[PDB]
Amino acid sequence: RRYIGYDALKKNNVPCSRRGRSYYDCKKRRRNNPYRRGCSAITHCYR
Amino acid sequence: PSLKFENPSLRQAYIALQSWKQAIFSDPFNFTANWNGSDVCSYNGIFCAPSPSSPKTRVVAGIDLNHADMAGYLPRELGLLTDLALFHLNSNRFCGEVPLTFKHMKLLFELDLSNNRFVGKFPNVVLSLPSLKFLDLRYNEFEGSIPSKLFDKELDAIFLNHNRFMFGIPENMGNSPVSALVLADNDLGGCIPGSIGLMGKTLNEIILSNDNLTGCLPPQIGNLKNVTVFDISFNRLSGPLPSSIGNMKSLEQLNVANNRFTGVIPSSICQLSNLENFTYSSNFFTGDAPRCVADNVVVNGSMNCIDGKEDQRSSKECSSPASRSVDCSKFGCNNFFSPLEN
Ligand SMILES: *[C@@H]1O[C@H](CO)[C@@H](O[C@@H]2O[C@H](CO)[C@@H](O[C@@H]3O[C@H](CO)[C@@H](O)[C@H](O)[C@@H]3O)[C@H](O)[C@H]2NC(C)=O)[C@H](O)[C@H]1NC(C)=O
Ligand SMILES: *[C@@H]1O[C@H](CO)[C@@H](O[C@@H]2O[C@H](CO)[C@@H](O[C@@H]3O[C@H](CO)[C@@H](O)[C@H](O)[C@@H]3O)[C@H](O)[C@H]2NC(C)=O)[C@H](O)[C@H]1NC(C)=O
Ligand SMILES: *[C@@H]1O[C@H](CO)[C@@H](O)[C@H](O)[C@H]1NC(C)=O
Ligand SMILES: *[C@@H]1O[C@H](CO)[C@@H](O)[C@H](O)[C@H]1NC(C)=O
Ligand SMILES: *[C@@H]1O[C@H](CO)[C@@H](O)[C@H](O)[C@H]1NC(C)=O
């Protein structure tokens, strides 16, 4: 029900609402190391 | 000065950030207020992480200033942030051109420069970025044509909508393994490049709406079996919908509105079980879609020359020079390489 393509049409919304977190890695923050990503396709791991 | 630094990387980062603090002219949400002292990691919007080259040395891994209404430009000194992996700059007021010095950001993975005041030609600097997989340049004022090398590069997502781009989509679009591609709200002339058929294994969402696209919809879109969103609205596309649309089994959002499509709605649209929202409105269709599975699936069939439905296009406005079927080869693009279904 939420798609990155249609969200891209809105200028304000971001994929990852957590500040400093990688878009690919919106999870509950413990350490926030962007170097460990674990995802390669936003459409499969969006928000 | 008298400031001691933990490692040489944060010292250059302090050089880069204070230089870029001088480049910032307006900070509504007082982000640069914290940019004092030698503890670079405490700066608002600056995010440190253990370096992969040496985990003991902490380095500046990310910069995230999303939704800050900050105004300024990107100075040359930002290229010293070689350890950067993410760079978030949505909803800022940074103007000018992307600096050539980003070539040193070898580890940069995702780049979001959306909703800004960047101008000039398309920044070819992002093409040199080795680790880049996420490129976001939406809502800016980048000029010129989209370079063909962009679609040769291995990227995950490319967003270029509502920018000052021109001169059509590069014909090598099919070479990009992108899962999400949005090139909408642009004055791009030409047809849908037929290279989309090559994108079947990787593409998941594509939106080409509100572009200046004229021509026929290529039938090799059926190879796009794992694409969820397919939006071609607000274009000058003429022709029939190919029966191959039913092969896009994962299609959830299908928007074909605001075009010049002739003929009937094929019966293969019946095969789409994941389809939840379908829109084929303000088109010159003469045949309606069947009853197959249409509650909880919204369909809008407005402004269509079908005799059965209600709220249809005017009789005058129908049987018009666009309502007439088109040769589909009278256009100068080569979308398709095999004759149409008929
Ligand atoms: C970010 O920090 C700056 C200061 O570091 C804040 O600016 C301050 O904003 C308040 C607004 O309530 C100003 O108070 C006003 O002063 C004028 C006198 O010129 C008075 O007539 C108003 O009735 C009001 O009391 C304050 O002077 C100003 N300080 C400055 C400019 O040094 C700013 O508000 C901070 N950002 C946010 C989002 O709060
Ligand atoms: C099913 O999908 C269709 C197509 O995407 C949805 O219709 C679209 O709805 C959006 C807003 O939700 C419309 O955007 C607006 O368009 C006006 C046009 O002037 C513009 O001024 C606004 O700023 C805004 O961008 C969009 O035009 C519209 N498209 C069509 C072809 O009607 C529909 O809402 C979806 N239905 C459900 C239940 O999700
Ligand atoms: C559409 O494209 C044609 C040629 O590409 C151009 O002359 C025209 O101004 C464009 N129209 C709109 C409304 O963008
Ligand atoms: C692609 O579509 C098939 C159709 O059943 C589905 O099983 C699969 O999970 C989808 N995604 C991928 C990555 O194959
Ligand atoms: C189709 O979209 C138009 C857009 O204005 C709207 O007026 C109309 O009610 C819609 N039809 C249906 C059946 O939702």
PDB file of N, CA and C in Angstrom, chain B residues 19 25 37-39 53 87 119 134 154 172 210 225 265-266 272 333:
ATOM      1  N   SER B  19      34.461  24.470   6.937  1.00  0.00           N
ATOM      2  CA  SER B  19      34.432  25.106   5.623  1.00  0.00           C
ATOM      3  C   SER B  19      33.016  25.135   5.066  1.00  0.00           C
ATOM      4  N   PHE B  25      24.261  29.702   4.621  1.00  0.00           N
ATOM      5  CA  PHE B  25      23.839  31.084   4.811  1.00  0.00           C
ATOM      6  C   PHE B  25      22.600  31.242   5.678  1.00  0.00           C
ATOM      7  N   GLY B  37      33.910  23.053  18.625  1.00  0.00           N
ATOM      8  CA  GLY B  37      34.786  22.073  19.235  1.00  0.00           C
ATOM      9  C   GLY B  37      35.365  21.082  18.242  1.00  0.00           C
ATOM     10  N   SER B  38      36.193  20.184  18.775  1.00  0.00           N
ATOM     11  CA  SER B  38      36.836  19.143  17.983  1.00  0.00           C
ATOM     12  C   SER B  38      36.059  17.833  17.939  1.00  0.00           C
ATOM     13  N   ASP B  39      35.018  17.671  18.757  1.00  0.00           N
ATOM     14  CA  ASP B  39      34.221  16.443  18.743  1.00  0.00           C
ATOM     15  C   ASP B  39      33.260  16.507  17.558  1.00  0.00           C
ATOM     16  N   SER B  53      37.907  -0.072   7.099  1.00  0.00           N
ATOM     17  CA  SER B  53      39.337  -0.306   6.930  1.00  0.00           C
ATOM     18  C   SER B  53      40.008  -0.570   8.270  1.00  0.00           C
ATOM     19  N   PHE B  87      24.482  10.227   2.338  1.00  0.00           N
ATOM     20  CA  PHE B  87      24.453  11.682   2.250  1.00  0.00           C
ATOM     21  C   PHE B  87      23.017  12.089   1.958  1.00  0.00           C
ATOM     22  N   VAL B 119      21.188  23.595  -9.896  1.00  0.00           N
ATOM     23  CA  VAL B 119      21.015  23.999 -11.281  1.00  0.00           C
ATOM     24  C   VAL B 119      22.214  23.503 -12.086  1.00  0.00           C
ATOM     25  N   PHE B 134      22.225   4.248  -4.950  1.00  0.00           N
ATOM     26  CA  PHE B 134      20.988   5.000  -4.765  1.00  0.00           C
ATOM     27  C   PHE B 134      21.259   6.450  -5.134  1.00  0.00           C
ATOM     28  N   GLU B 154      25.472   0.260 -12.799  1.00  0.00           N
ATOM     29  CA  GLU B 154      24.703  -0.647 -11.950  1.00  0.00           C
ATOM     30  C   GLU B 154      24.175   0.138 -10.756  1.00  0.00           C
ATOM     31  N   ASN B 172      19.251   3.152 -24.046  1.00  0.00           N
ATOM     32  CA  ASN B 172      19.874   2.083 -23.274  1.00  0.00           C
ATOM     33  C   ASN B 172      19.283   1.952 -21.877  1.00  0.00           C
ATOM     34  N   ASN B 210       3.530  12.200 -16.632  1.00  0.00           N
ATOM     35  CA  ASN B 210       3.690  13.641 -16.838  1.00  0.00           C
ATOM     36  C   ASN B 210       4.995  13.947 -17.559  1.00  0.00           C
ATOM     37  N   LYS B 225       7.619  -9.264 -15.194  1.00  0.00           N
ATOM     38  CA  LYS B 225       6.783 -10.088 -14.328  1.00  0.00           C
ATOM     39  C   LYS B 225       6.874  -9.731 -12.848  1.00  0.00           C
ATOM     40  N   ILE B 265      -9.794  -2.704 -24.253  1.00  0.00           N
ATOM     41  CA  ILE B 265      -9.081  -3.176 -23.066  1.00  0.00           C
ATOM     42  C   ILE B 265      -8.946  -4.688 -23.185  1.00  0.00           C
ATOM     43  N   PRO B 266      -7.739  -5.220 -23.382  1.00  0.00           N
ATOM     44  CA  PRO B 266      -7.597  -6.661 -23.623  1.00  0.00           C
ATOM     45  C   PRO B 266      -8.173  -7.491 -22.486  1.00  0.00           C
ATOM     46  N   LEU B 272      -4.369 -10.578 -13.922  1.00  0.00           N
ATOM     47  CA  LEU B 272      -3.626  -9.863 -12.885  1.00  0.00           C
ATOM     48  C   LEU B 272      -4.342 -10.022 -11.549  1.00  0.00           C
ATOM     49  N   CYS B 333      10.321   6.686 -33.270  1.00  0.00           N
ATOM     50  CA  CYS B 333      10.886   5.711 -32.358  1.00  0.00           C
ATOM     51  C   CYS B 333      10.675   4.298 -32.888  1.00  0.00           C
TER      52      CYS B 333
END
